[PDB]
Amino acid sequence: RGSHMWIGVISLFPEMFKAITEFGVTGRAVKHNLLKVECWNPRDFTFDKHKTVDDRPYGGGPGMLMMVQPLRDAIHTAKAAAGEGAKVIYLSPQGRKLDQGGVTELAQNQKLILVCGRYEGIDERLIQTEIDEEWSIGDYVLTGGELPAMTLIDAVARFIPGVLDGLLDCPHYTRPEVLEGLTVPPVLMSGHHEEIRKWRLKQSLQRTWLRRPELLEGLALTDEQRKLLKEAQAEH
């Protein structure tokens, strides 16, 4: 149309992204030219014999950093290929927390460049001069930002035209009817779609309430949803 999404990746390990470009939903999205994922490797932007990509930190210590020159130059080549208006994102443990709202924001960009850290990360000044936003997938210690980048790609790809609420899912049941002695809720077997709808929405709201209450803090629930939630809170 062209609504195809383009995502550039800066990574020391571009072959990892096969995990999203060759498999599943994203893989089908790449096969049908709805998503293009392009990788540039800082290892290819070095000029010494040994293709060095780490550097010592000013101040000393054991924590190596990504070498500034090969990293910056990969970013620039990626910006040159994106053309005007690509948003550059540092997958960073000190970034803004990723959540579904954040995903919808990022999905509104047609060109993104993802920068994946290694070692203890990248020079602070590279954030000022090259990074537009910093995003984190959660508060845990990883060894690189590739997996966070792929998670991020997977989440945004669902907003690409041609690829196909905010609360937790209701329980799902498939065959068989009785599984190790455990039976499906009769309402789902009943065949009355209006009782099934009310139950599924009510169970969704109770799950959200019990297991992730904070997802409710930003919604104004519908009349029906407030009624079904109040019932479920009392029945508990």
Distance CA 57, CA 62 (A): 8
Ligand-binding site membership of 95 (annotated): no
Q: Which residues pair with 5 in a beta bridge?
A: 35
Q: How far is the CB of 167 from ligand EFY (least distance, A)?
A: 6
- Which of the listed partners (ligand EFY, its own copies, none) does 211 bind, with a CB threshold of 5 to 8 Å by partner kind? its own copies
In the numeric block, the tokens 């009943």 are attached to 190
C-beta of 102 vs 148, nearer to ligand EFY: 148
Residue 21: CB partners within 8 Å, gap ≥ 6? 27, 30, 37
- List, comma-separated, the residues after which the chain is broken, a break being a C to N distance over 2.5 A; otherwise answer none: 164
CA distance 99 to 218: 12
How many of the chain's residues bind ligand EFY (CB under 6 A)? 23
Q: Which stretch binds ligand EFY (CB under 6 A): 17-25, 67-75, 139-147, 217-225?
A: 139-147
b/e burial code for range 50-80 (CB count within 10 A of at least 16 → b) = eeebebeeeeeeeeebbbeebbbbbbeebbe
117 annotated to bind ligand = yes
Residue 89 annotated as part of some ligand binding site: no
Report, in Å, the least distance between residue 190 CB and its own copies.
9
Q: CA–CA distance from 85 to each of 8, 88, 108, 164, 212 (Å)?
A: 13, 9, 12, 27, 36
Nearer to ligand EFY, 64 or 196 (CB): 64
- Cα angle vertex 54, ends 52, 139, to 5°? 145
Q: What element of type H or E holds 97?
A: strand 87-97
* 23, interface contact from ligand EFY, its own copies, none, CB < 5-8 Å by kind: its own copies
Site for ligand EFY in 142-201 (CB under 6 A): 142-145, 148, 166-169
Choosing among its own copies, ligand EFY, none, which partner's interface includes residue 91 (Cβ < 5 to 8 Å by kind)?
ligand EFY
* For its own copies, the closer CB: 113 or 153: 153
221 assigned ligand-binding residue: no
Residues 5 and 34: their CA atoms lie apart, in Å, by 6
141 is in an annotated binding site: yes
Q: Which residue in the set 100, 108, 190, 233 belongs to the binding site for ligand EFY (CB under 6 A)?
A: 100
Contact residues for ligand EFY, defined by CB under 6 A? 91-93, 100, 117-118, 121, 136-145, 148, 166-169, 215
Q: Which residues are annotated as a binding site for S-adenosyl-L-methionine?
A: 90, 117, 137-142
Q: Which residues are annotated as a binding site?
A: 90, 117, 137-142
